[PDB]
Amino acid sequence: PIETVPVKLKPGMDGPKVKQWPLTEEKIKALVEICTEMEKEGKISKIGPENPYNTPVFAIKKKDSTKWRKLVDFRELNKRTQDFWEVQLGIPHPAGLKKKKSVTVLDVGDAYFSVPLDEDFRKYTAFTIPSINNETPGIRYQYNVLPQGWKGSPAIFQSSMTKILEPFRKQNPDIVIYQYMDDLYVGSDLEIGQHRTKIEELRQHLLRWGLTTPDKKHQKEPPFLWMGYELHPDKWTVQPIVLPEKDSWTVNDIQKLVGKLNWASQIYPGIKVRQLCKLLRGTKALTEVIPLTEEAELELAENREILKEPVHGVYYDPSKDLIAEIQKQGQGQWTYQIYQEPFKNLKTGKYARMRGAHTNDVKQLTEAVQKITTESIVIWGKTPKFKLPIQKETWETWWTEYWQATWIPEWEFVNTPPLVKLWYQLEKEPIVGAETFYVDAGYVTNRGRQKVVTLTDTTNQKTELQAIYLALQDSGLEVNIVTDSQYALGIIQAQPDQSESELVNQIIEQLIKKEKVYLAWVPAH
Amino acid sequence: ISPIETVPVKLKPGMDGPKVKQWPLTEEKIKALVEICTEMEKEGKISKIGPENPYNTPVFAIKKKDSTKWRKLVDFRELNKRTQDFWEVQLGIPHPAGLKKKKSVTVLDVGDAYFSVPLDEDFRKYTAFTIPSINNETPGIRYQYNVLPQGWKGSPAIFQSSMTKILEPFRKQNPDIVIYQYMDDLYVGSDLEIGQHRTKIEELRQHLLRWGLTGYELHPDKWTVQPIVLPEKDSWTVNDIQKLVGKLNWASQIYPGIKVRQLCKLLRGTKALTEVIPLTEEAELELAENREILKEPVHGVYYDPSKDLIAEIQKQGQGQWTYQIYQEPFKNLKTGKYARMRGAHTNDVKQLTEAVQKITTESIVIWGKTPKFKLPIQKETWETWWTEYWQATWIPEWEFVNTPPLVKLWYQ
Ligand SMILES: CC(C)=CCN1Cc2cc(Cl)cc3[nH]c(=S)n(c23)C[C@@H]1C
Ligand SMILES: [Mg+2]
């Protein structure tokens, strides 16, 4: 038997005392039968009038079958049960798995009832099966094992299974076992016969504790279509994605398409969705039809072709280095691929996360490095050596001059156009011979010139970007610009090369054409 | 699993235990953690827990100073914040104002001293922690403490007595030495020449071994506050004057006696930036007075035991950093500078960690409390690399921020 896990109710609460719904004789007859079965099996045992707690039960028929099932409504008891460590949503990613000669999945089979329930807690699982004639039986029961559908069941069952498997695991340190729901995955590099035997051995080890497992004649064989994936002994991939051939596309359709499209990203490089996302602008209803533009059409056609190609990922080989390579697919878009062996990945991906309203490729590429770093540590436990399209000098220039602290692991420059660069750099010292503009929506120069323009609907801070812009447009190749807007100063000082604000983008364009620019700040009153 | 008497500890009223997430660990760290945790399990220090304990506290592996040995570090920060305060009356522990004046102070990690005292059976669940697994391939090894844990605030309090008894002899045999405890750390100050100092340090060591109790060497005396400085130059241009004004216009919020009048008058007219402007007599004397005013920290800054200690750090470049410790805005208790040390390796993160640590030691030595840092770095980055260079046994509360371009220009 297994060691009982002590359960407690949430502090300051009493057990469930909820009424049982009136039942149909037909069903009562079914319940009495099922409950007796469970009592003979010791799963449950009748109680005395001592117990005031109760939980509703009802009979259900099996889907597309003709027979009775017993369902207990543990909602209430669950609200009152303490929290457990429970199952974290942390699941293994296919690219983290290694190659195996043979893998099998043993379907545990309701081991919930195979595991005992803390005696002290047992009373809280009380339920009642009403009598057929008014004043009569009305059998009262309580659980002796883990109730199907109870709060602690999934957690306690998993903990129990782990203990039960500790030994078998120490005995065979060449066999990986992974638990998931009512499934037990066993993988191994044993030649087929040896494996097949070891599996039968594991089954017996479960049977000793009551975990009735399935025979090799009805077990699930690879691939393992698990969570949108298709698991194989040596390779992996995602469940085949089929793109619709619609004439009319609803916003809902377009939205689902982008979702399926994004999913593919992790393995299919080249998947693009920008054009498709644009169809969502100004949409008034999920049922609204948006015709497709020539660019969206071209993008859909391209992804369709990309998907007609059954690419697959490869498992991790602990003996070889991890290599991450990053590229610029578009403005703001970066594509990466992690491989151990020359140009054939374990996983791929995209990075479009724009942090802040303005940025530059150098800053953005850096942030992609950090995402991959976190992701690699999570999946493979170590960071990959990166191959980036930026030269050392370029990175060091930006780095040492930026106010924030940054650090890139270990990388190598890869001359693969486009090479990321800084399109412009502000002067560290005011330009001699250059004209000086004193902005405020209007500027005045040392040379006498001046323009006062009219701005409508402008925000306080945007008016400040405008003046700078103005000075920028009317000046020569070399300019000195004095401003009082610490805001505008901040932005332009950041050396952005892309922004959400078109005004900033224009200023940026102006900045690129100049030979020399010095921006200075001063309080103005 | 426990001996002697266990002192009952409780979380603050109504407070529940911590359920903090574990930041992803590197395979090497995990391995180090598994090796270390198994020995602690055998020694009965910790025990595997079941799914009926929902709590969690983050753990990490750091590297001991000049030693190929890892040290499990447990981020008990949240738990400590939820742990009851500890008594009143005659608490022989406060803080030696004298410790900061000493010539040499050594730090000793007397953390293992806790491992000899059991933790109240009931509080044990709250100290829960989890060794993570590569790619979630396995549930994760869960443990809790049976003994006073390192890094928890309750530990020094509960061991306080056992500690004083042990130190009373050395304390009365060498009163020319100042010893102050902070968490797992022990501060040993003295004015003896470096030679006699290290000797005495070593002697305290074996004296601790004597009772089962098994690196860093400061010089608090030489700590000096960094004042606000103004560019002194041969000839001044419009630009120089413009900057001098912005700076002085800021420092005035601190020292109000700073005037800019004359200097501003030199900035009349849309002249060219590069145009050199000689300073009128009345301006030269204004700048000069401004200089004298900045020669010293602002009068009236007092440490308040009841307020948070905040520390801000700024990237100045080429391995240089500037920090300030204060409680009320602009009212600094201290300001300083930091330049890359220990290795032709240094990158932004390693330096920041060294700096944070450096500033933290000082606060403990000075006020006997760690500060709340405002770090100039992206969270994800910090969380990924901080552990790789950390060596302290305590972990201060930190937050991340976006340093203003102007503040930098006003320091160093
Ligand atoms: C569905 C999940 C999470 C399976 C995890 N699972 C089964 C599996 C399946 C294949 Cl085809 C190759 C695998 N390689 C490895 S490692 N595993 C694995 C780990 C365990 C044994
Ligand atoms: Mg102006």
UniProtKB/Swiss-Prot annotation, chain B:
Reported effect, P156S: Confers resistance to lamivudine
Q: What is the effect of changing I134T?
A: Confers resistance to delavirdine, efavirenz and nevirapine
Recorded consequence of changing P220L:
Confers resistance to atevirdine and delavirdine
Effect the entry attributes to changing G189S: Confers resistance to efavirenz and nevirapine
Mutagenesis or variant effect for K100E = Confers resistance to atevirdine, efavirenz, nevirapine and zidovudine
Task: Look up what happens after changing Y187C.
Answer: Confers resistance to nevirapine
Impact reported for D66G: Confers multi-NRTI resistance
Q: What is the effect of changing G189A?
A: Confers resistance to efavirenz and nevirapine
Changing G317E has the effect of: Confers resistance to abacavir, lamivudine and zidovudine
Q: Site annotation (Essential for RT p66/p51 heterodimerization): which residues?
A: W385, W398
Mutation: K102N; reported impact is:
Confers resistance to atevirdine, efavirenz, emivirine and nevirapine
Result, substituting Q150M:
Confers multi-NRTI resistance
Per the record, what is the consequence of mutating E43A?
Confers resistance to lamivudine
Specify the effect of K69R: Confers resistance to zidovudine
Q: What is the effect of changing P51R?
A: Confers resistance to stavudine
Phenotype upon changing S67Y: Confers multi-NRTI resistance
UniProt effect for mutating L73V: Confers resistance to abacavir, didanosine, HBY 097 and zalcitabine
Positions of Mg(2+) 1 binding: D109, D184, D185
Please state what the protein is called. p51 RT
Tell me what gene encodes this: gag-pol
